RNA sequence: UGAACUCGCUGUGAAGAUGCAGUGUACCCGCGGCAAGACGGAAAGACCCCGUGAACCUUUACUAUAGCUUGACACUGAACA
């Protein structure tokens, strides 16, 4: 079963890794307990969307950051 | 219970005759008795054989099968050596 994990996980990933597991790993236990979620191409693009979303607040962020570390040695 | 005007003998004859041939005997009709015969009555022989019949029963007959048992996969996962 592909699933995406949630909370990072022992031998598996992190939060957003996707990974195969055995079905009732992620049924009985991952699933239930709000570890992980199926690989659902919805929610892969929902995870795409999240990462690169991520990605641009974090290049963005930077680009916040920088400014403010040329504003410093500006004065 | 085919119809009877329904005797003996010896012989003949699907070969054990009231009914055929030959012959003997016998006037017509009951009643009480007897069971030698009518291969008497009753039951499409149960023995015996036959039918490429039936059934039930047995088994190391054949073919299947419930049940019991084997292993693979599924429900069925994690960590650690
Ligand atoms: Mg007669
Ligand atoms: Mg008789
Ligand atoms: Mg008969």
Redesign the pocket.
Known sequence: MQVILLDKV???GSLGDQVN??????????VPQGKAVPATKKNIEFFEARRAELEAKLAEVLAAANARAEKINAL
């Open positions: 022992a031998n598996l597991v055995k079905a009732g790993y992620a049924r009985n236990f991952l």
